[PDB]
Design a protein around this ligand. Sequence first.
Ligand SMILES: [Mg+2]
Ligand SMILES: [Mg+2]
Ligand SMILES: [Mg+2]
Ligand SMILES: [Mg+2]
Ligand SMILES: [Mg+2]
Ligand SMILES: [Mg+2]
Ligand SMILES: [Mg+2]
Ligand SMILES: [Mg+2]
Ligand SMILES: [Mg+2]
Ligand SMILES: [Mg+2]
Ligand SMILES: [Mg+2]
Ligand SMILES: [Mg+2]
Ligand SMILES: [Mg+2]
Ligand SMILES: [Mg+2]
Ligand SMILES: [Mg+2]
Ligand SMILES: [Mg+2]
Ligand SMILES: [Mg+2]
Ligand SMILES: [Mg+2]
Ligand SMILES: [Mg+2]
Ligand SMILES: [Mg+2]
Ligand SMILES: [Mg+2]
Ligand SMILES: [Mg+2]
Ligand SMILES: [Mg+2]
Ligand SMILES: [Mg+2]
Ligand SMILES: [Mg+2]
Ligand SMILES: [Mg+2]
Ligand SMILES: [Mg+2]
Ligand SMILES: [Mg+2]
Ligand SMILES: [Mg+2]
Ligand SMILES: [Mg+2]
Ligand SMILES: [Mg+2]
Ligand SMILES: [Mg+2]
Ligand SMILES: [Mg+2]
Ligand SMILES: [Mg+2]
Ligand SMILES: [Mg+2]
Ligand SMILES: [Mg+2]
Ligand SMILES: [Mg+2]
Ligand SMILES: [Mg+2]
Ligand SMILES: [Mg+2]
Ligand SMILES: [Mg+2]
Ligand SMILES: [Mg+2]
Ligand SMILES: [Mg+2]
Ligand SMILES: [Mg+2]
Ligand SMILES: [Mg+2]
Ligand SMILES: [Mg+2]
Ligand SMILES: [Mg+2]
Ligand SMILES: [Mg+2]
Ligand SMILES: [Mg+2]
Ligand SMILES: [Mg+2]
Ligand SMILES: [Mg+2]
Ligand SMILES: [Mg+2]
Ligand SMILES: [Mg+2]
Ligand SMILES: [Mg+2]
Ligand SMILES: [Mg+2]
Ligand SMILES: [Mg+2]
Ligand SMILES: [Mg+2]
Ligand SMILES: [Mg+2]
Ligand SMILES: [Mg+2]
Ligand SMILES: [Mg+2]
Ligand SMILES: [Mg+2]
Ligand SMILES: [Mg+2]
Ligand SMILES: [Mg+2]
Ligand SMILES: [Mg+2]
Ligand SMILES: [Mg+2]
Ligand SMILES: [Mg+2]
Ligand SMILES: [Mg+2]
Ligand SMILES: [Mg+2]
Ligand SMILES: [Mg+2]
Ligand SMILES: [Mg+2]
Ligand SMILES: [Mg+2]
Ligand SMILES: [Mg+2]
Ligand SMILES: [Mg+2]
Ligand SMILES: [Mg+2]
Ligand SMILES: [Mg+2]
Ligand SMILES: [Mg+2]
Ligand SMILES: [Mg+2]
Ligand SMILES: [Mg+2]
Ligand SMILES: [Mg+2]
Ligand SMILES: [Mg+2]
Ligand SMILES: [Mg+2]
Ligand SMILES: [Mg+2]
Ligand SMILES: [Mg+2]
Ligand SMILES: [Mg+2]
Ligand SMILES: [Mg+2]
Ligand SMILES: [Mg+2]
Ligand SMILES: [Mg+2]
Ligand SMILES: [Mg+2]
Ligand SMILES: [Mg+2]
Ligand SMILES: [Mg+2]
Ligand SMILES: [Mg+2]
Ligand SMILES: [Mg+2]
Ligand SMILES: [Mg+2]
Ligand SMILES: [Mg+2]
Ligand SMILES: [Mg+2]
Ligand SMILES: [Mg+2]
Ligand SMILES: [Mg+2]
Ligand SMILES: [Mg+2]
Ligand SMILES: [Mg+2]
Ligand SMILES: [Mg+2]
Ligand SMILES: [Mg+2]
Ligand SMILES: [Mg+2]
Ligand SMILES: [Mg+2]
Ligand SMILES: [Mg+2]
Ligand SMILES: [Mg+2]
Ligand SMILES: [Mg+2]
Ligand SMILES: [Mg+2]
Ligand SMILES: [Mg+2]
Ligand SMILES: [Mg+2]
Ligand SMILES: [Mg+2]
Ligand SMILES: [Mg+2]
Ligand SMILES: [Mg+2]
Ligand SMILES: [Mg+2]
Ligand SMILES: [Mg+2]
Lengths: 91, 247, 112, 77, 63, 50
Amino acid sequence: AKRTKKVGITGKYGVRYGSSLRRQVKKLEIQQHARYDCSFCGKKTVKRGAAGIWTCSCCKKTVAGGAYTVSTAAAATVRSTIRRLREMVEA
Amino acid sequence: GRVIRNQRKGAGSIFTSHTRLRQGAAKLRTLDYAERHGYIRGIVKQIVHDSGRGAPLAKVVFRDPYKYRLREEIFIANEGVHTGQFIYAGKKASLNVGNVLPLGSVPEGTIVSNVEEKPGDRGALARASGNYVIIIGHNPDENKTRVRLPSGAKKVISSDARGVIGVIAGGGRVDKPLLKAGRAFHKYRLKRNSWPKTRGVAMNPVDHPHGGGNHQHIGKASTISRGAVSGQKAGLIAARRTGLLRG
Amino acid sequence: AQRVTFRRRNPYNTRSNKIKVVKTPGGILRAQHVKKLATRPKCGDCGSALQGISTLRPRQYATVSKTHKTVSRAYGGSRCANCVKERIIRAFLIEEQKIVKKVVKEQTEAAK
Amino acid sequence: AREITDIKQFLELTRRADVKTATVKINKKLNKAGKPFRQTKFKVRGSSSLYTLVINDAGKAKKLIQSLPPTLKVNRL
Amino acid sequence: AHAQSKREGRHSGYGKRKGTREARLPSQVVWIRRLRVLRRLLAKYRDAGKIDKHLYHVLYKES
Amino acid sequence: AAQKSFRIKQKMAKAKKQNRPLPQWIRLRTNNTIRYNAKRRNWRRTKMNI
RNA sequence: CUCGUAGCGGUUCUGACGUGCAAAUCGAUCGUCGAAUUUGGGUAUAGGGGCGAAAGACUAAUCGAACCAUCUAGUAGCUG
RNA sequence: UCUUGGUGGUAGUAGCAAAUAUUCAAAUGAGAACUUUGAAGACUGAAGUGGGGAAAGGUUCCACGUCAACAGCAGUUGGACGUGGGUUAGUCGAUCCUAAGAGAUGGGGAAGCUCCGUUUCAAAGGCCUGAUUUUAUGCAGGCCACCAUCGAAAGGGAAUCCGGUUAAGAUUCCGGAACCUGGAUAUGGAUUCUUCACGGUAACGUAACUGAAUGUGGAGACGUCGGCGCGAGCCCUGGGAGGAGUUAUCUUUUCUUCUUAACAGCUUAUCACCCCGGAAUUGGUUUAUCCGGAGAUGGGGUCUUAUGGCUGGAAGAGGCCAGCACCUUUGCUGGCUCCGGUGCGCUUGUGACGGCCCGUGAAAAUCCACAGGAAGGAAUAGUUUUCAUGCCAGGUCGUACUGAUAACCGCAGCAGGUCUCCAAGGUGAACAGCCUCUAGUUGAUAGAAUAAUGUAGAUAAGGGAAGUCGGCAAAAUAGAUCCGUAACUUCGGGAUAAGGAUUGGCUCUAAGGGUCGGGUACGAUCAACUUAGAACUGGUACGGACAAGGGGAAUCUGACUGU
Ligand SMILES: [Mg+2]
Ligand SMILES: [Mg+2]
Ligand SMILES: [Mg+2]
Ligand SMILES: [Mg+2]
Ligand SMILES: [Mg+2]
Ligand SMILES: [Mg+2]
Ligand SMILES: [Mg+2]
Ligand SMILES: [Mg+2]
Ligand SMILES: [Mg+2]
Ligand SMILES: [Mg+2]
Ligand SMILES: [Mg+2]
Ligand SMILES: [Mg+2]
Ligand SMILES: [Mg+2]
Ligand SMILES: [Mg+2]
Ligand SMILES: [Mg+2]
Ligand SMILES: [Mg+2]
Ligand SMILES: [Mg+2]
Ligand SMILES: [Mg+2]
Ligand SMILES: [Mg+2]
Ligand SMILES: [Mg+2]
Ligand SMILES: [Mg+2]
Ligand SMILES: [Mg+2]
Ligand SMILES: [Mg+2]
Ligand SMILES: [Mg+2]
Ligand SMILES: [Mg+2]
Ligand SMILES: [Mg+2]
Ligand SMILES: [Mg+2]
Ligand SMILES: [Mg+2]
Ligand SMILES: [Mg+2]
Ligand SMILES: [Mg+2]
Ligand SMILES: [Mg+2]
Ligand SMILES: [Mg+2]
Ligand SMILES: [Mg+2]
Ligand SMILES: [Mg+2]
Ligand SMILES: [Mg+2]
Ligand SMILES: [Mg+2]
Ligand SMILES: [Mg+2]
Ligand SMILES: [Mg+2]
Ligand SMILES: [Mg+2]
Ligand SMILES: [Mg+2]
Ligand SMILES: [Mg+2]
Ligand SMILES: [Mg+2]
Ligand SMILES: [Mg+2]
Ligand SMILES: [Mg+2]
Ligand SMILES: [Mg+2]
Ligand SMILES: [Mg+2]
Ligand SMILES: [Mg+2]
Ligand SMILES: [Mg+2]
Ligand SMILES: [Mg+2]
Ligand SMILES: [Mg+2]
Ligand SMILES: [Mg+2]
Ligand SMILES: [Mg+2]
Ligand SMILES: [Mg+2]
Ligand SMILES: [Mg+2]
Ligand SMILES: [Mg+2]
Ligand SMILES: [Mg+2]
Ligand SMILES: [Mg+2]
Ligand SMILES: [Mg+2]
Ligand SMILES: [Mg+2]
Ligand SMILES: [Mg+2]
Ligand SMILES: [Mg+2]
Ligand SMILES: [Mg+2]
Ligand SMILES: [Mg+2]
Ligand SMILES: [Mg+2]
Ligand SMILES: [Mg+2]
Ligand SMILES: [Mg+2]
Ligand SMILES: [Mg+2]
Ligand SMILES: [Mg+2]
Ligand SMILES: [Mg+2]
Ligand SMILES: [Mg+2]
Ligand SMILES: [Mg+2]
Ligand SMILES: [Mg+2]
Ligand SMILES: [Mg+2]
Ligand SMILES: [Mg+2]
Ligand SMILES: [Mg+2]
Ligand SMILES: [Mg+2]
Ligand SMILES: [Mg+2]
Ligand SMILES: [Mg+2]
Ligand SMILES: [Mg+2]
Ligand SMILES: [Mg+2]
Ligand SMILES: [Mg+2]
Ligand SMILES: [Mg+2]
Ligand SMILES: [Mg+2]
Ligand SMILES: [Mg+2]
Ligand SMILES: [Mg+2]
Ligand SMILES: [Mg+2]
Ligand SMILES: [Mg+2]
Ligand SMILES: [Mg+2]
Ligand SMILES: [Mg+2]
Ligand SMILES: [Mg+2]
Ligand SMILES: [Mg+2]
Ligand SMILES: [Mg+2]
Ligand SMILES: [Mg+2]
Ligand SMILES: [Mg+2]
Ligand SMILES: [Mg+2]
Ligand SMILES: [Mg+2]
Ligand SMILES: [Mg+2]
Ligand SMILES: [Mg+2]
Ligand SMILES: [Mg+2]
Ligand SMILES: [Mg+2]
Ligand SMILES: [Mg+2]
Ligand SMILES: [Mg+2]
Ligand SMILES: [Mg+2]
Ligand SMILES: [Mg+2]
Ligand SMILES: [Mg+2]
Ligand SMILES: [Mg+2]
Ligand SMILES: [Mg+2]
Ligand SMILES: [Mg+2]
Ligand SMILES: [Mg+2]
Ligand SMILES: [Mg+2]
Ligand SMILES: [Mg+2]
Ligand SMILES: [Mg+2]
Ligand SMILES: [Mg+2]
């Protein structure tokens, strides 16, 4: 059954630390504990491995990433920027 | 009349950094002939975690150009760099995330990391997790490159100084509350002894310039001169302004 | 029930001071000091425990014969028969790609 | 302490010129209905090992204890 | 004699219980016993062949 | 300590051999002033301090 | 996180004791008890110095500047 | 309040009252509350008042003699006094390695004592030759770019176990049985007329099966918690073979012995892998939901040997008995030492997993493997001493004992303090408290009497905080099962809110398992403790000792946990 109404993974913190602080920790704990899809083998098996380290259990491949997500919006922006720059330099 | 806590930090006894569990100094490869005239290919073997450092560290193996052996360089891992990826370092390397290039051989608006201030100091700028350097100008005559630093500072450095394409991995790390004193305890346990911090207004006058009194208050201005001496610089040193950023 | 003692002068429950209560032909319970368990050798590429090789503490490997320490394949006691297969295949297709690259670069430099 | 299960190799062991001594031990294994037999153990003392041959047949035993080399010192029980 | 009385079922009432029910016998231990019973039974019926591999797969997750 | 230094044991040996009463004939010599052993040491009364 | 042993502390009785068992203990009652835990050994920091989750706390029963020796028989309009 | 020494009164006084506790006899002795032995009674109650160690101590250990002093009474006793005796190692430690760190040199600084620095801005270096007669092997090439040393008796690390043995030593002695390192060195086997093995599709196998420089890889080498599974030892229990206890009565009964070390051979596994095969009607599957066209299920196999089994060790030892010898030298002879079961049990080891982290949880010595292919060797012989057997050696220092209500520190034989291992039965959730077994102790000045006042423990009619600064102190409550559970809230709590019922014994009943199988409408058998219900019963007692929250309504204050 649905055990909690809104605390989710932050139910371990009880009544401590403030609800805004627990809601702020919640969105990043869900992200860092989520399984992500491997870019290399297509399976959704990528775990977090001491933040910034995103390891796929199958195929044993490790990607440097964000602290709580495998990819950040800034890094996706940077890949698009380097892709555009490389395409306009070597063409 | 007692030597205060920030004056005790320079004696370096119990305020040294805790360096047992660190992997080694993260540096660029040495600026040799291969990087100066062509490129060299290394291999990411491991992406490991460095204690005290928010950013993961890449271990990149290069072939030694002059002896038959392998050189393991320790890089700060850029986001998207993966194990088994080839890394190319040199003047002729391509614009790929993880590649090490001189800044003169790199276009404008390019995001770089682990940037040498001077060519051959093996990485100085934009090393913390999530940080990067924008390339904002080139002056080819008497070769210079204008860069933007993570503090917003404009800075002219040499075109022969090398950087690594991409942002530093580990970004967003300070976006989480620690929530509790133990997480700050374990954070600082492998950095250095700088936590917990007792306030100077909570001390006796012998311990701090802010110490003493029948209420905890400062009593003189917290803004201290740049031309003040040790024992006096306890507050907001050489403040151009104070207060909230409100207009 | 009979109770035992450490037999060496170390009184602490360290990694090196592990014991095991055993019964003797004299009918009594003695502590028997246990050596640390051997870790299997690992593959140099993937890191998995590689099969066929005896699991010994490191100076015990100087006492056993070459057969216990080696598989009869190339990279026998170092790599793990899938990393060996991967590196043979990677080798062979990269020299075939090298001669294709050589002929293609020679053609595009001799044609223009 | 090793167990030799071959009479040819045991007689080969008894003449290796570092062997001086062998004990011959008679055990008695009387089970429920299988074999109420006495078992002999020829234990020959090498320099590095003690080799034992277990013989469960008494007729096979008596010819071996008769056939041991003459210079070898035999202890009985 | 007290053990024989216990094995017939004496001295085991509300006036004799001092620990909680999960202290006396854990609810997870009861679950592990029960689920291993159902899974041994399902494996036995599949391997005999009186239960096919689709009714097995429905009843395994139902158990 | 039961796991001794040799130097510690050697000073123990010296202290053991000095732990004896006065020899009786020294009290009989011509113009003797020694009555007793004024450097007598016991394990229970004074520690010999390594 | 919690109840509560071991442990680690030290609330209250302002209990006992108060020429003590003890220059800080004893008993009951208490706080906490899976970590900013407790602890051994090794190691580093030394006196206007150290170290301090801060009490001028602690730095060998010594601390609003330790201990030892010397200057030194310091000086005293003050007391015997 | 002089200095040093001595001495009074107080004064035969205060006191010698924590740690439940002693008592009877005999012996010894001048002398026994206190010594020894027997007997009885008790306690510590396996997180011990037991068995060992670390630091520290240093002979306190043990024996003989002995009581002037010391043991705040005594003393014939003693950790006291006097005199001796006692500590045995290739395998246990140190020694070696590195750790945080300490520290020479080169060099710079400083009047200088000395400071910095630890690979630095130094001309910092010694190792094999492929195996021999112009060689004390070098006067041959050739390689290495490393850089003092100290630093752990809890980290890393070559290798030893059992039984016996002393007054006091033992993983050290003796007996038997091993193993490791270094060295020398033959034999047998293997390998060579295709020179440097062969088999298997493969995973891999084997008794061996050349392999330099150089490089690479592994091991050393690692957090914490959780449940699960397996092993060991302990606990529990059945049969049988002995021995002892009880026996007015009952009890096929109560207790006790029934063991198998290092090392060795053969086997034995989760995981992992290989071959075949080609999967949706998706299957396999864990307590925990992961895995499968990147090849699942399934069918064959391969492996690591944690661990177990069998055998050797090894029954000859150890244990339990019997009979006869009975200053017998001092024993002798004989028998049995066997077969099971059980499990959310306890302790420990370990495996495969899961969770946690802005924390991802040593290094070095050391050993091995691989890559490479220098160099060398096939005919009455060379190579391997990574196969087997054989030969020699293994130094130095520590080692006794206590480890604490008497061997350490606290002025002392001080209710303090001081690190750790092992760990029986019952009650019970429990390593709580309470009682007991093994082992240990019965030590602490005693005897008589039972005033006041104490200290510690209690009880109390009726009232129920009127006491007091203040419910301080005490009492009340308490476990478990079932019911019920407000405001407020950060929606997680509050909460065991508040409150209310039930509980024993006995005799039953009903559920909940494991082994057990099929035709090319069928149950023997074995075992466990959980829950629920019912009758009967009793001076309505029943968490019967022990163990064990008082609660609520609010206000000030600091968020919390913490110091
Ligand atoms: Mg100071
Ligand atoms: Mg100071
Ligand atoms: Mg400061
Ligand atoms: Mg440092
Ligand atoms: Mg800090
Ligand atoms: Mg702050
Ligand atoms: Mg602050
Ligand atoms: Mg203050
Ligand atoms: Mg103050
Ligand atoms: Mg000041
Ligand atoms: Mg102030
Ligand atoms: Mg303030
Ligand atoms: Mg100022
Ligand atoms: Mg093998
Ligand atoms: Mg009953
Ligand atoms: Mg009952
Ligand atoms: Mg009851
Ligand atoms: Mg309970
Ligand atoms: Mg339980
Ligand atoms: Mg549950
Ligand atoms: Mg010495
Ligand atoms: Mg002392
Ligand atoms: Mg807690
Ligand atoms: Mg609590
Ligand atoms: Mg107290
Ligand atoms: Mg008081
Ligand atoms: Mg408490
Ligand atoms: Mg508190
Ligand atoms: Mg708390
Ligand atoms: Mg708790
Ligand atoms: Mg907890
Ligand atoms: Mg020290
Ligand atoms: Mg200091
Ligand atoms: Mg000064
Ligand atoms: Mg003070
Ligand atoms: Mg002084
Ligand atoms: Mg004077
Ligand atoms: Mg005066
Ligand atoms: Mg006077
Ligand atoms: Mg005087
Ligand atoms: Mg006097
Ligand atoms: Mg008197
Ligand atoms: Mg009196
Ligand atoms: Mg008194
Ligand atoms: Mg008493
Ligand atoms: Mg008498
Ligand atoms: Mg008396
Ligand atoms: Mg009696
Ligand atoms: Mg008792
Ligand atoms: Mg004695
Ligand atoms: Mg006497
Ligand atoms: Mg006396
Ligand atoms: Mg006397
Ligand atoms: Mg006495
Ligand atoms: Mg004595
Ligand atoms: Mg004596
Ligand atoms: Mg003596
Ligand atoms: Mg050793
Ligand atoms: Mg060293
Ligand atoms: Mg120096
Ligand atoms: Mg100089
Ligand atoms: Mg030194
Ligand atoms: Mg050393
Ligand atoms: Mg050591
Ligand atoms: Mg370690
Ligand atoms: Mg060690
Ligand atoms: Mg060593
Ligand atoms: Mg022995
Ligand atoms: Mg002894
Ligand atoms: Mg032997
Ligand atoms: Mg061997
Ligand atoms: Mg062969
Ligand atoms: Mg290895
Ligand atoms: Mg944990
Ligand atoms: Mg937890
Ligand atoms: Mg078992
Ligand atoms: Mg052995
Ligand atoms: Mg051994
Ligand atoms: Mg399969
Ligand atoms: Mg434990
Ligand atoms: Mg070697
Ligand atoms: Mg190789
Ligand atoms: Mg060799
Ligand atoms: Mg020796
Ligand atoms: Mg010696
Ligand atoms: Mg000894
Ligand atoms: Mg000893
Ligand atoms: Mg001892
Ligand atoms: Mg003792
Ligand atoms: Mg002592
Ligand atoms: Mg002293
Ligand atoms: Mg004192
Ligand atoms: Mg004491
Ligand atoms: Mg004392
Ligand atoms: Mg209990
Ligand atoms: Mg007993
Ligand atoms: Mg007394
Ligand atoms: Mg009343
Ligand atoms: Mg009343
Ligand atoms: Mg009332
Ligand atoms: Mg009232
Ligand atoms: Mg009133
Ligand atoms: Mg009044
Ligand atoms: Mg009031
Ligand atoms: Mg009060
Ligand atoms: Mg009260
Ligand atoms: Mg309940
Ligand atoms: Mg309630
Ligand atoms: Mg409330
Ligand atoms: Mg009710
Ligand atoms: Mg009942
Ligand atoms: Mg207030
Ligand atoms: Mg607070």
